[PDB]
Automatic annotation (TrEMBL), chain E:
Homomultimer; the oligomeric structure is essential for the polymerase activity. Interacts with nucleoprotein N. Interacts with protein Z; this interaction inhibits viral transcription and replication, Z partially blocks the product exit tunnel for the releasing nascent RNA product. This is RNA-directed RNA polymerase L. RNA-dependent RNA polymerase, which is responsible for the replication and transcription of the viral RNA genome using antigenomic RNA as an intermediate. During transcription, synthesizes subgenomic RNAs and assures their capping by a cap-snatching mechanism, which involves the endonuclease activity cleaving the host capped pre-mRNAs. These short capped RNAs are then used as primers for viral transcription. The 3'-end of subgenomic mRNAs molecules are heterogeneous and not polyadenylated. Belongs to the Bunyavirales RNA polymerase family. It is found in: Host cell; Virion; Host cytoplasm. Classified as His(-) endonuclease since it does not have a histidine upstream of the active site that coordinates the first cation. His(-) endonucleases display very low activity in vitro, although they are clearly active in vivo. It comes from Machupo virus. The chain holds residues 1490 to 1537 of 2209 of the full protein. The N-terminus contains the endonuclease activity (endoN). The central region contains the RdRp activity. The gene is L.
TrEMBL record, chain F:
Homomultimer; the oligomeric structure is essential for the polymerase activity. Interacts with nucleoprotein N. Interacts with protein Z; this interaction inhibits viral transcription and replication, Z partially blocks the product exit tunnel for the releasing nascent RNA product. It comes from the Viruses. Belongs to the Bunyavirales RNA polymerase family. Classified as His(-) endonuclease since it does not have a histidine upstream of the active site that coordinates the first cation. His(-) endonucleases display very low activity in vitro, although they are clearly active in vivo. RNA-dependent RNA polymerase, which is responsible for the replication and transcription of the viral RNA genome using antigenomic RNA as an intermediate. During transcription, synthesizes subgenomic RNAs and assures their capping by a cap-snatching mechanism, which involves the endonuclease activity cleaving the host capped pre-mRNAs. These short capped RNAs are then used as primers for viral transcription. The 3'-end of subgenomic mRNAs molecules are heterogeneous and not polyadenylated. This is RNA-directed RNA polymerase L. The N-terminus contains the endonuclease activity (endoN). The central region contains the RdRp activity. It is found in: Host cell; Virion; Host cytoplasm.
């Protein structure tokens, strides 16, 4: 349980059951004069609420100024002020990537609305699937604000610069929600998806090579097939307008046009230009090579020392090469949950190695 | 040890480790010179003969990862050392070729400013502005396209006209075309252990049907994001030049294009309203799609607003982007020491107030960071974070100036600080006008703060009265015998600051919440050093609450001398720091900070630009090989050790290259002893703003501090 | 033209003093730009009156303030009310033979193997050296002499040491230390009046044995003249008082006006100083206090022409019409 | 480095120099000699002419599939004619048919589209943010219960700090 | 010629003492030799 | 006055390699000649 003071007599209690940096489920209670009441419960991640820890006056000032930006019409800011404040509040109480994507889509919408011509596939890049029924309210608030500022028949653009600035600053509210990868495994999986999808769609993703510069007949066959498919686009067929590839005719045209000093650039250059981690794991705090080197060095030092008996001071060695009870605690406190788990794993390895050496 | 471990795990509450130890205990786990000469020390894998797909030393292996962004995560490719060197050579060649070019703006701020002003003029005049963002620039390009391009080019020499042979470049590109990208082991385990997914379907189809579990993926079109950036930039530049030529020849318009290797901006001037240009732009889109330059649906064409590198220009002015800077200021609280956090927040608030945000919001951010550093258990210090109750004078003012402003605001009726400013002005006049002072102030300052201040005073002029009066104001400096020892949440596997800044100049995934939590936790152990280590509250509990009408003007900030008799090791005068700051501002940005502050006698929407009004007297150019000579002269042992092992140009720094600068001699010794001035690392840097948008309501409420001539107009 | 250096420095000093009271220390003399008097190696001519403090600064003095009125010679014409006191022998053996006299006869018999050891003389000579101007000073000197006791004739000497103290100016202590080294005392006839008198005070006794056996010193002639400053010579019951201030070009020792030294400005200099000042009220005070100082000077050379129309920029008719 | 703890760290380089001189003087293949000299120097970019670049019967098809249409010597006027013909074909084959990629705004249609995509109408959620989000309901409850309504404790906190420290 | 050289030396002396802006650059200009050092001092004073 | 420990500092400043070699092997008082004992004389810099 944690405590926070709110008034002269009543305090607030925060009850939970787990430790670490994972997402937990919390329960909030109050206490006025000893009678412990019930306020509620929720489920959230603690490392996504660092912004409002003390920014209770900065947000008020910035929203007050953003609302006073629209002081050109007495009656328009009175309707957008509370709406803006409620939208900001709902954004702070619900951090998610979908909200950021929605506000970026709103920014692009405003950018396309200000100008005169826009792409025909615009409205399909603004929709985002909402879940947990929490994005509905923020999307409705943003849409209502955009409509209240943009709608109108004739007297809807009395001061369009102020309106554009306000809407842009509203769409840019996505920077308030932090970007700290809500889940690592899902993000890595999605990255692998986005990486390997176009290559499977094209049809040229080969399987594990020899890693030495020796390809089989099928590998080189499919490589040459992909190379041919890359340079097999014509200048008249309108069917291939979204698949990768280039036509050789236009390339030859551009080359012959650039060679004979026709473009704004030419080949008249000066100053002649001719003057241990593992790759299969990026993001891990410790690779297998480093763990193995550490355990080998530690067991070697312990074998050299036995020239038996060994106290827990060997654990101190683990703390010395990775980053006397006081120094031990000071070097042990600086580890994270995954770090302390890896340290316990290394400790287990070193201890079982010493035990098997003892036999 | 096995039985000891089992017993120690059994006596505790957890039984899982007990079961693991119980299981591992139960034993439940049961004469040619080309072949016999490459096993001792022969570097057999050295590149001597290569093929069109490898180099006899690997196949340019890579590694896949992601990078965090606001909207969606970006790709990331990290390579081995050999492929890193090859990519470095390729990118150096391509960046040289691009620097030889003009229109591209990726590593040239001059062309960026040119594009900015051209876009502004076009928006003010009403030309056709088209911002083209392209979708899937990375995962679509292929090294074969660059290969064909470089095969088709000539690259004529400037004075030889020799048609340089791009043989090695084509060889390295052929090597890159057959690169091997290794998949992460986490995705492999997640798909092996075990909703519809196409890549998961491909993984399960290539799991054991054709071969083994996929771990290495080679293909034609990869072009790893952040690998071939310069080559892609140059290719896009030439393609856009060809396209603008074609448009100029077909639709008799005047196009000018600026590129950034990911997005472009085209300014089109039409002859002789804008409803008859749809065919032109769709033909341009078709021609770009004929190349590998597919345009994204987010690209916009109009005549009212333009965008380039997230910099929106509209008719008349520019959008300030308030909330972006506000969120950037509230975020990225990376604290190793309170001083570096204060400096980071200083830079951020400066670049924020540069874009006409406000003067009442920055005060709130400064109060916020003050409360953050106070909550950590450090207590408020005279310098601390950014001062409160600032003004629009962030222009023509550096960190030293605002620190001086804070120290001046500490005192209500400045008589001690005014006297110190007068003494600093006297020293400045006698060192510049009288011009007889050098390297003796170096001998007088190296001692410390107390004797140096009274020495400067008796050089100017004083008595024992001033010695016992000025030197009474003391503040607690916890980092007096060194720096605060602490181990924060860093990554695994692992002297004044001016030396470190110079070493950084010569040479070439963690969360903010957890970082601040570790900061507050490590600021509670034995941190302050002496002689041994102890607590901060232990030091702050030894002060005596005398309350003698002089240590009460600002509690927990300023004390008297006898109030620190119990703990006197951490007690330094603040007037010495004020003197140092005044002299440092004098050597930095002129002598207009010696006068007294006078106070003066608009719809919140009248914005306008202002320029700094600084005047330097410190040899304005101030390049390298000047601080190095001064350090070699003044601090020989400090110039030999900890400095210049990684240097081969000592001859020019030794042969008196404009030796004995006007003020770099004395304006450098105050920086090495004081741990919070930081001016030598600031003089070797640009303003980075050069212009400040501000509202008129803040310009009329500023303080008028312009100094008359100290000689009272009496000199000549 | 160092004469111009001197007169411009004096003008700056007087016009800077006539805006607010300042102390007459090195803080208000070295802190001025026109103090080029430390330069100009040929220092035969000083500004108007500050010879003594300039000669002191050439030795890098740390003085603050005193009655610098050398016009009335403080080093010459000084009262010479000189005297002496008894002695106190070191290597204490007299406390055992002082009280048993209650006599002097056994002490005289003891003073009559041979036991002539070293002799320690301690003197505290206090004088009241005055000066020509209205002032006073009390200066006492401690003298410790290590000599050799004699058999019968006079005495034998080895070494001497002096330590001045008390309240007195530089010229006062200079006169005192010069006359104590050139007096009818030990150096010469020694003017020594033994008469078994100071022994009767040290060795407590009220009897005489009809034998004085007068002694005389033959001191070497050491020269302890190394202070020459306002310093009270490392000891004194009175320190750091009598501060000199300046309000209207007149020396104020405690509030009384001593005199005003003449300073010329020729009109252009005063406006050249009035050009860049702190604020409006400072110029008001300066221009209101100028003509009261003009009453103590004689300078009409200030050109009444276009320069006066330039001074007219500071519209202060009340200040120029108040003195009338 | 070839340093060790048995020699004075000055003979190893001499032996290495003597050995490479003896090797370059007389030998006894082609690449086994270039690596032996390279693996005994101390320190040593582009211009990799020391390489061999041997063919493997595979780069043939690479060059045959990569450099057949690359000429780079086309005249200037024929390109003009080809672009003119391509534009004349584009104008009346794919643009007059309605297969473009861009269109005018018609701001009313954009407003309708945003109201359709953003403002949800087929959802069962109510128009109140407090009863939808749990954290908003919690903060509302706390604020509306708070707004509308001694040496013992310090000794206790001190002993709490002492036991937490020990 | 020697009177002109004495005048140049007097000018260097005045600018190094009265003007008081000269140090360690004459060291860099003199270490070369006699010819270039003399013409450098001359063009510092003034000549053709 | 012009005593010792002034030419030595000037040589150390102007000619470092000439101050290390051929000079000061037979010296144990380098600390006072290094801690700027009245450094930058009026003319000993250029008159040397
Ligand atoms: Mn863009
Ligand atoms: Zn106090
Ligand atoms: Zn509700």
């Amino acid at each position: 349980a944690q405590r926070f003071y709110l008034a002269e007599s009543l305090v607030g209690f925060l009850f939970y059951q787990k430790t670490g940096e994972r997402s937990r489920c919390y329960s909030v209670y109050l206490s006025d004069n000893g009678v412990m009441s019930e306020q509620g419960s929720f489920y959230c991640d603690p490392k996504r609420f660092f912004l409002p820890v003390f920014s209770d006056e900065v947000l008020a000032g910035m929203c007050e100024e953003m609302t006073s930006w629209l002081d050109f019409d007495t009656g328009l800011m009175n309707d957008t002020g509370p709406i803006l404040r409620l939208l900001v509040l709902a954004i702070l109480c619900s951090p998610s990537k979908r909200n950021q994507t929605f506000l970026q889509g709103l920014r692009y919408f405003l950018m396309a609305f200000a100008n005169q011509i826009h792409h025909i596939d615009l409205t399909s890049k603004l929709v985002v699937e909402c879940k947990s029924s929490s994005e509905v309210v923020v999307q409705r608030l943003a849409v209502g604000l955009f409509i209240r500022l943009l709608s109108g028949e004739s007297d809807a653009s009395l001061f369009f610069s102020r309106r554009f600035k306000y809407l842009l600053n509203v769409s840019y509210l996505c920077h308030l929600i932090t970007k700290e990868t809500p889940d690592r495994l899902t993000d890595q999986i999605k990255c692998f998806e986005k990486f390997i999808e176009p290559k499977v769609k094209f049809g040229c993703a080969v399987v594990n090579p020899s890693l030495n510069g020796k390809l089989t007949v099928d590998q080189e066959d499919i490589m040459i097939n992909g190379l041919k498919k890359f340079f097999s686009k014509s200048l008249r067929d309108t069917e291939d307008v979204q698949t990768p590839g280039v036509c050789k005719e236009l390339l030859n045209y551009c080359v012959s046009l650039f060679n004979r000093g026709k473009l704004k650039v030419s080949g008249e250059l000066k100053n002649n230009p001719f003057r241990i981690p593992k790759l299969d794991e990026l993001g891990n705090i410790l690779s297998t090579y480093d763990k193995e080197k550490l355990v080998s060095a530690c067991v070697s030092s312990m074998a050299e020392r036995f020239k038996n008996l060994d106290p827990d001071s060997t654990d101190y060695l683990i703390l010395k090469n990775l980053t006397t009870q006081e120094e031990l605690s000071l070097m042990y406190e600086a580890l994270t949950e995954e770090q302390v788990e890896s340290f316990n794993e290394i400790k287990h390895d070193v201890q079982v190695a010493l035990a098997k050496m003892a036999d | 040890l096995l039985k000891n471990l089992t017993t120690s795990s059994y006596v505790d509450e957890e039984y899982f480790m007990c079961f693991k130890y119980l299981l591992i205990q139960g034993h439940f786990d049961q004469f040619t010179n080309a072949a016999l000469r490459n096993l001792c020390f022969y570097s057999e894998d050295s590149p001597t003969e290569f093929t069109s797909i490898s180099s006899n030393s690997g196949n340019l292996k890579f590694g896949l990862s992601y990078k965090e962004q606001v909207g969606s995560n970006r790709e990331l490719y990290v390579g081995d050392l050999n492929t890193k060197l090859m990519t470095r050579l390729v990118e150096d060649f391509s960046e040289a070729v691009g620097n030889s070019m003009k229109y591209t703006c990726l590593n040239s701020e001059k062309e960026f400013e040119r594009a900015i002003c051209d876009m502004k003029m076009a928006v003010n005049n009403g030309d056709l502005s088209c911002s083209y963002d392209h979708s899937k620039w990375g995962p679509t390009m292929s090294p074969a396209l660059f290969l064909a391009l470089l095969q088709m080019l000539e690259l004529r020499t400037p004075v030889d006209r020799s048609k340089i042979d791009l043989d090695s470049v084509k060889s390295i590109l052929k090597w890159h075309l057959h690169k091997v990208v290794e998949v992460p082991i986490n995705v492999a385990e997640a798909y092996c252990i075990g909703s519809t997914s196409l890549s998961e379907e491909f993984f399960h189809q290539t799991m054991q049907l054709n071969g083994q579990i996929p771990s290495h993926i080679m293909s034609v079109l990869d072009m790893g994001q952040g690998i071939l950036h310069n080559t892609s930039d140059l290719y896009g530049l030439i393609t856009e030049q060809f396209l603008c030529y074609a448009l100029d020849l077909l639709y008799d318009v005047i196009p000018v294009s600026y590129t950034s290797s990911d997005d472009q901006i085209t300014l089109i001037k039409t002859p002789s309203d804008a409803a008859e240009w749809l065919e032109m732009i769709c033909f341009h889109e078709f021609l770009s799609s004929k190349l590998n330059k597919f345009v994204s649906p987010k690209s916009v064409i109009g005549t009212f607003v333009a965008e380039f590198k997230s910099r929106f220009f509209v008719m008349g002015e520019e959008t300030p982007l308030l909330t972006k800077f506000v969120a950037a200021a509230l975020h990225n609280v990376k604290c190793k020491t309170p001083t570096q956090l204060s400096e980071t927040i200083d830079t951020i608030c400066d670049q924020c107030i540069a874009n006409g945000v406000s003067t009442k919001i920055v005060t709130r951010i400064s109060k916020r960071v003050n409360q953050l550093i106070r909550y950590s258990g450090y207590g408020e210090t005279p310098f601390g974070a950014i001062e409160d109750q600032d003004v629009k004078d962030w222009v023509d003012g550096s960190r030293g100036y605002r620190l001086q402003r804070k120290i001046e605001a500490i005192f209500h009726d400045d008589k001690e600080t005014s006297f110190i400013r007068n003494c600093a002005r006297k020293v400045f006049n006698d060192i510049k006008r009288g011009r007889i002072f050098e390297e003796n102030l170096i001998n007088l300052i190296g001692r410390g703060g107390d004797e140096a201040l009274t020495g400067f005073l008796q050089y100017a002029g004083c008595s024992e009265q001033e010695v016992n009066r000025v030197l009474n104001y003391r503040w607690v400096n916890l980092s007096s015998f060194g720096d605060l020892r602490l181990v924060l949440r860093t990554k695994l596997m692992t002297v004044p600051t001016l030396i470190k800044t110079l070493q950084s100049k010569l040479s070439r995934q963690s969360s903010v919440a957890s970082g601040f939590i570790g900061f507050c936790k490590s600021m509670g152990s034995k941190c302050v050093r002496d002689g041994g280590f102890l607590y901060i509250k232990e030091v702050y509990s030894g002060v005596s609450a005398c309350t003698c009408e002089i240590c009460a003007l600002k509690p927990k900030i300023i004390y008297c001398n006898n109030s620190l008799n119990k703990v006197s090791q951490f007690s330094k005068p603040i007037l010495w720091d004020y003197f140092s700051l005044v002299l440092t501002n004098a050597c930095e940005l002129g002598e207009w900070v010696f006068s007294t502050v006078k106070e003066p006698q608009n719809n919140q929407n009248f914005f306008w630009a202002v320029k700094p009004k600084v005047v330097r007297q410190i040899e304005d150019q101030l390049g390298m090989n000047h601080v190095l000579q001064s350090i070699r002269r003044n601090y020989p042992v400090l110039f030999d050790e900890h400095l210049t092992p990684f240097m081969n140009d000592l001859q020019v720094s030794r042969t008196m290259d404009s030796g004995r600068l006007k003020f770099l001699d004395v304006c450098i010794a105050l920086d090495m002893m004081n741990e919070n001035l930081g001016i030598i690392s600031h003089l070797l840097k640009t303003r980075d703003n050069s212009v400040y948008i501000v509202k008129q309501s803040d310009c009329a409420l500023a303080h008028i501090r312009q100094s008359s001539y100290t000689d009272w107009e009496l000199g000549l | 033209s160092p004469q111009q250096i001197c007169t411009n420095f004096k003008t700056q000093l007087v016009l800077s003093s006539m805006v607010n009271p300042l102390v007459l220390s090195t803080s208000c003399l070295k802190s001025f730009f026109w103090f080029n008097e430390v330069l100009e190696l040929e220092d035969d001519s000083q500004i108007e009156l500050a010879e003594l403090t300039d000669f002191a600064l050439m030795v890098k003095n740390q003085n603050v303030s005193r009655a610098m009125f050398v016009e009335d010679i403080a080093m010459g014409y000084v009262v010479s009310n000189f005297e002496g006191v008894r002695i106190s022998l070191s290597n204490v053996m007299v406390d055992g033979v002082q009280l048993p006299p209650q006599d002097i006869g056994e002490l005289f018999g003891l003073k009559a193997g041979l036991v002539v050891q070293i002799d320690h003389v301690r003197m505290s000579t206090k004088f009241k050296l005055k000066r020509k101007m209205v002032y006073s000073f009390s200066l006492e000197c401690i003298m410790d002499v290590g000599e050799i006791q004699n058999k019968e004739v006079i005495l034998k000497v080895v070494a001497v040491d002096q330590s001045v103290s008390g309240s007195g100016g530089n010229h006062m202590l200079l006169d005192g230390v010069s006359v104590v080294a050139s007096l009818p005392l030990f150096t010469g006839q020694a003017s020594f009046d033994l008469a078994a008198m100071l022994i009767e005070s040290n060795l407590a006794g009220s009897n005489d044995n009809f034998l004085m056996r007068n002694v005389t010193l033959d001191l070497g002639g050491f020269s302890p003249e190394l202070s020459d400053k306002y310093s009270y010579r490392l000891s004194g019951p009175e320190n750091q008082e009598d501060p000199l201030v300046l309000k209207d070009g007149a020396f104020y020792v405690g509030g009384e006006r001593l005199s005003t030294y003449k300073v010329e400005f020729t009109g252009d200099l005063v406006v050249k100083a009035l050009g860049a000042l702190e604020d409006d009220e400072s110029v008001v005070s300066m221009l209101h206090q100028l003509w009261p100082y003009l009453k103590a000077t004689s300078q009409v050379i200030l050109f009444q022409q276009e320069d006066f129309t330039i001074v007219h920029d500071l519209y202060k008719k009340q200040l120029t019409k108040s003195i009338e | 480095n070839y340093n060790n703890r048995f020699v004075a760290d000055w003979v190893i380089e001499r032996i290495r120099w003597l050995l490479i001189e003896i090797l370059k003087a007389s030998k006894s293949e082609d690449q086994e000699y270039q690596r032996l000299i390279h693996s005994l120097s101390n320190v040593k970019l582009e211009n990799l002419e020391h390489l061999k670049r041997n063919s493997l019967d595979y780069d043939e098809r690479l060059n045959e599939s990569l450099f057949i249409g690359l000429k780079g010597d086309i005249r200037e006027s024929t390109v003009r004619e080809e672009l003119i013909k391509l534009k004349l074909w584009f104008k009346d084959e794919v643009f007059s048919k309605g297969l473009g990629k861009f269109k005018l705004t018609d701001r009313r249609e954009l407003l309708e589209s945003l109201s359709s995509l953003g403002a949800h109408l087929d959802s069962d959620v109510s128009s109140c943010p407090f009863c939808n989000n749990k954290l908003m309901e919690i903060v509302y409850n706390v604020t509306f219960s708070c707004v509308e309504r001694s040496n013992i404790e310090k000794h206790y906190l001190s002993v709490l700090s002492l036991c937490n420290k020990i």
